[PDB]
Write a protein that binds this ligand. Structure first.
Ligand SMILES: *[C@@H]1O[C@H](CO)[C@@H](O)[C@H](O)[C@H]1NC(C)=O
Ligand SMILES: *[C@@H]1O[C@H](CO)[C@@H](O)[C@H](O)[C@H]1NC(C)=O
Length: 273
């Protein structure tokens, strides 16, 4: 309250020091995480602050994330996309499904970090696969359920009228079933995928049970930090050094308060309206 206690101005530009900034450009953090074909340049990157642009768009299989805001926050705070492949035992199914809705280098493809499993010899066995976490750090697994447009497609892919998936650890259990039906066509696709996530602590075991419709993980992400973050801004990133980042640009950390934006990253004045 009073102009000498409150910072109110900005240059419209975010400084690239002192924090490590990653410009999402045309990719959302979630598309970089799943491995959309336009986002392969983000693999394994780290950040203090991820800057997400309003013109970001998707170019792979159409999907939703029931828990979108939480998964986005978790990965943003973590500050890394470091990914480690694991070899799951997918005996009895066909692996590596691809789609014309997801083109990579001019061929049908799919999210790089997910594995679209389908029937083998007209049988989709009841999969029961495990992956112990014998590491000293937490693992994050991203997986999904495919919702076909029609019963014909469901049968063609899975040789099963309705899949059931349960993914569990000693600490949690999630069970999902496809919702078959035709939705508006995105890149000519009336079907969808819904994305889910599961953390496995050291000493715990990932258990995956599926009878159909599983979009499987190929491995795990690490959880690196709890102090990175994400912000939506269209400000350019320039070569300068400034302590407090806001969507409206970086500002110095000088007065007790600021009314530039309630969203900030770094050592900053407190927001006051
Ligand atoms: C993969 O899983 C099946 C269980 O249905 C088993 O028969 C097979 O031996 C497993 N492979 C390995 C290498 O454990
Ligand atoms: C599936 O793709 C993975 C990685 O792209 C590859 O290593 C593997 O050989 C493929 N498996 C099959 C059964 O096609």
């Amino acid at each position: 309250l009073g102009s000498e206690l409150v910072q109110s101005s900005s240059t419209g530009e975010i400084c690239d020091s002192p924090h490590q900034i990653l410009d999402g450009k045309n990719c959302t953090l979630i598309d970089a995480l799943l491995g959309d074909p336009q986002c392969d340049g983000f693999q394994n990157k780290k950040w203090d602050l991820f800057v997400e642009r309003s013109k970001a768009y998707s170019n792979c299989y159409p999907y939703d994330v029931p828990d979108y805001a939480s998964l986005r926050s978790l990965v943003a705070s973590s500050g890394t996309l470091e990914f480690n492949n694991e070899s799951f035992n997918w005996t009895g199914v066909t692996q590596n499904g691809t789609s014309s809705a997801c083109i990579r280098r001019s061929k049908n493809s799919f999210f790089s970090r997910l594995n679209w499993l389908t029937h083998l010899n007209f049988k989709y066995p009841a999969l029961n696969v495990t992956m112990p976490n014998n590491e000293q750090f937490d693992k994050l697994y991203i997986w999904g359920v495919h919702h076909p447009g029609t019963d014909k497609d469901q049968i063609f892919l899975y040789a099963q009228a309705s899949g059931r998936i349960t993914v569990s650890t000693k600490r949690s259990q999630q069970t999902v079933s496809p919702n078959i039906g035709s939705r508006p066509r995105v890149r000519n696709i009336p079907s969808r995928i819904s994305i889910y996530w599961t953390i496995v602590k050291p000493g715990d075991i990932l258990l995956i049970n599926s009878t159909g419709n599983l979009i499987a993980p190929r491995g795990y992400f690490k959880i690196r930090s709890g102090k990175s973050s994400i912000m939506r801004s269209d400000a350019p990133i320039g070569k300068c050094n400034s302590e407090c980042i806001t969507p409206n640009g970086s500002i110095p950390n000088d007065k007790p308060f600021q009314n530039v934006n309630r969203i900030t990253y770094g050592a900053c004045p407190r927001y006051v309206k």
